[PDB]
Structure 1
Amino acid sequence: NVTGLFKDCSKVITGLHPTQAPTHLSVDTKFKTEGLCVDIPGIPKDMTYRRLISMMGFKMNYQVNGYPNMFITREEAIRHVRAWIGFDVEGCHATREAVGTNLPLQLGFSTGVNLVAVPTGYVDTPNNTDFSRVSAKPPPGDQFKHLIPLMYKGLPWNVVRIKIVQMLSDTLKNLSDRVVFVLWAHGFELTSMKYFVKIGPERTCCLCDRRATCFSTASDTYACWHHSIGFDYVYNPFMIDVQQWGFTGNLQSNHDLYCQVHGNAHVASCDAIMTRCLAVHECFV
């Protein structure tokens, strides 16, 4: 019994030294005996490795006192329709030094905004995890050709997450005290949220008495949507996956049952607009 969360995507044939492996599974077979591991005299540590670790497979099903649920019910989502922001991500694939994981490339929102990130991943090294640019390629096939020019137009993640917080703040400051991301098949959107969301207990703005929706790594401070300039993380967002409401085929076929004004222009923002539009038609029309 294994999971794909934190799968090692390197092409290194062997596992790690017992002192460097994050887990028993990741220790090389050579050190395993009698149900546990042994240190073997004469076998060195590896002091130059870079191992890409996959962020696919997060499970936000904890129940911890004082920490809000990220995923909400359809009934709670309906009460907060003014906080709805459709969200979709088109990814690129790890290549060359690693294979087997998807990295965010084009982040699209129901506001019509698309942000492009440099392909960046979580690379374990002998001393830490290095959040860094990794080799990547767009998925092959004619349906993905539009992602080709995006491979060289990406912004560093430190710039992308500030732009996400600014866009959300500009959009929601006069609409809600929160954000509800409206998703369709949430796995990769949740993986992408690792790059720009933090969670914790409910907090208030540094500059006023409103509920904190943003966090700053610069000062370890919290802001509402009105005082978040320069804030880099979205704090305690909510979300819902529309696909789990009983639809059977793809997003476009379900969206098109109720709406004709949103033609598919094959981009992350268009999928985000269609997702929020389908949810609105399903709950309010």
Structure 2
Amino acid sequence: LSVDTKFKTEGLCVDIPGIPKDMTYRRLISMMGFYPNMFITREEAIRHVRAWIGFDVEPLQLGFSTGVNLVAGLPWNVVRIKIVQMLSDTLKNLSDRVVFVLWAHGFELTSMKYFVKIGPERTCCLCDRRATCFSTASDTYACWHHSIGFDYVYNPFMIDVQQWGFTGNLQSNHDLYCQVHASCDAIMTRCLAVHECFVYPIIGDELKINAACRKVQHMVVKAALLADKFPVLHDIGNPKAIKCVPQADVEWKFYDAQPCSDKAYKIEELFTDGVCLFWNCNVDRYPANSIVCRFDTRVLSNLNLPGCDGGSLYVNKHAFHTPAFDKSAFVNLKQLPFFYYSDSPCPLKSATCITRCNLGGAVCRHHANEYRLYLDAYNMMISAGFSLWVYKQFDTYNLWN
């Protein structure tokens, strides 16, 4: 983002009366009292969504989308220490930076000089990550992991949503899309920005989660077909359009539905023969003859960011805004019970290890190993926030035969 790009300044003229209408980023940064630009493009912001922290200023009340309000009542030299600590603990497992997301009216921008320092890009003094903080006590730099005791934010980034072309004030623009939400403005601001852009690097267990989801899907569907012998399966929303049980006898019919990022699909808009499979295809109410995996937006993980109108921004390779978890959607189904099924050729005791060996009295070692690995993946999937539901007649007792 060129520092010579124009900044629309009408939103600032109540806190800064008389501000020129003609204004570049270069001149605004100078006026803020200060890595080509502190400000970034929408595109760049989107690529670093994990780094977003709503920030509003209203003595001055500083509010962040973490829900914290600070009053700068204590002097700036202690307030800045709290800011560094809060951002480090919020972001250290999400991002190599911070992006302050503003609805800029002026005070938030003139207050930056009291807790921000800028300079060349640097590296942490204790590791190889880019530096995000600076300490005036030791004249050293640190990343979010090693910033304990550091008093200044270093080379933050920032983006003013009001530059995107909105009519009306923040609240009225936010409330058009979200009924769930200084800190309250910081939250609305980030929320509105997530809605505009969404309604990525490996930072955690992405790869184990995705392999576990693939394994569970194959297990549960294969077993549903064996136990109930459905003649046809309606696979709704498959992004890959690959059969998850390619050797099953059934007639596999695919129906295309992109991941709904706003409201859940209405089943009437989007089948009574056989079984319906919804693997992360979010509808308002699932038919009774369904196998379903639905992500619980309420779960706490480094992969799951707070979203708009109760949904969450699930970032796992790609960004997937997901509508709010609603228990009533599953009213025609029951929770899927854990089980492990295998027909592969053959000390574990388990009533839910459904294999020939266990049927005959004693689980062989191979199926003991595979059961324990499968349990591990299953638990990884549940902990990651996924929930599984199945048609009410599903009964693993039917697998023994």
TM-score bucket (shorter structure):
0.5 to 0.7
Which of 155, 166, 169 in structure 2 is aligned with 1:236?
155
Match of residue 208 from structure 1: 127
User: What SS is found at the alignment partner of 1:108?
Assistant: strand
Output the aligned Cα RMSD: 1.7
Distance across 2 between alignment mates of 1:156 and 1:187 = 20
**Corresponding letter in the other structure for 1:111:** T
Whether 1:83 and 2:38 are equivalent positions in the alignment is: no
Of Structure 1 and Structure 2, the greater helix share is in: 2
In the TM superposition, residue 68 of structure 1 has moved relative to its aligned partner by 3.1
1:174-221 Cα deviation digits (max 9, x unpaired): 000000000002532111101100000000111111100000010110
**Corresponding letter in the other structure for 1:114:** N
**Equivalent residues in 2 for 1:36-47 (5 A)?**
none
TM-score calculated relative to the size of structure 2: 0.42
**Corresponding letter in the other structure for 2:197:** C
Aligned 8 A contact 1:72 1:240 in 2: yes
Match of residue 193 from structure 2: 279
Whether 1:107 and 2:62 are equivalent positions in the alignment is: yes
Distance across 2 between alignment mates of 1:78 and 1:186 = 22
Whether 1:175 and 2:89 are equivalent positions in the alignment is: no
Which of 168, 179, 186 in structure 2 is aligned with 1:260?
179
1:242-266 Cα deviation digits (max 9, x unpaired): 011111111000001111101xxxx
Distance across 1 between alignment mates of 2:42 and 2:108 = 18
Match of residue 60 from structure 1: 29
Distance across 2 between alignment mates of 1:186 and 1:222 = 31
Aligned 8 A contact 1:85 1:109 in 2: yes
Distance across 1 between alignment mates of 2:156 and 2:136 = 17
Whether 1:199 and 2:118 are equivalent positions in the alignment is: yes
Distance across 1 between alignment mates of 2:141 and 2:53 = 21
**Corresponding letter in the other structure for 1:239:** M
In the TM superposition, residue 69 of structure 1 has moved relative to its aligned partner by 1.2
**Corresponding letter in the other structure for 1:189:** E
**Corresponding letter in the other structure for 2:29:** M
Cα distance change, pair 83–107 in 1 and its aligned pair in 2 (3 A): same
Whether 1:221 and 2:140 are equivalent positions in the alignment is: yes
Distance across 2 between alignment mates of 1:174 and 1:229 = 15
**Corresponding letter in the other structure for 1:107:** L
Unaligned runs of 5+ in 1: 1-56, 93-104, 118-153, 263-267
Distance across 2 between alignment mates of 1:239 and 1:229 = 23
User: What SS is found at the alignment partner of 1:60?
Assistant: helix
Match of residue 116 from structure 1: 71
In the TM superposition, residue 279 of structure 1 has moved relative to its aligned partner by 0.2
Cα distance change, pair 108–79 in 1 and its aligned pair in 2 (3 A): same
1:75-104 Cα deviation digits (max 9, x unpaired): 1001000000000001x5xxxxxxxxxxxx
**Corresponding letter in the other structure for 1:274:** M
Which of 153, 176, 183 in structure 2 is aligned with 1:269?
183
TM-score calculated relative to the size of structure 1: 0.58
1:144-200 Cα deviation digits (max 9, x unpaired): xxxxxxxxxx11211100000000000000000000000002532111101100000
Bigger Rg, structure 1 or 2 = 2
**Corresponding letter in the other structure for 1:194:** K
Percent sequence identity over matched residues? 96
Higher-RCO chain (CA-CA 8 Å, sequence separation at least 6):
1
In the TM superposition, residue 61 of structure 1 has moved relative to its aligned partner by 7.1
Unaligned runs of 5+ in 2: 1-25, 200-401
**Corresponding letter in the other structure for 1:219:** S
Cα distance change, pair 58–233 in 1 and its aligned pair in 2 (3 A): farther
Point out 4+ residue stretches in structure 1 off by more than 4 angstroms.
none
Cα distance change, pair 223–272 in 1 and its aligned pair in 2 (3 A): same
Match of residue 163 from structure 1: 82
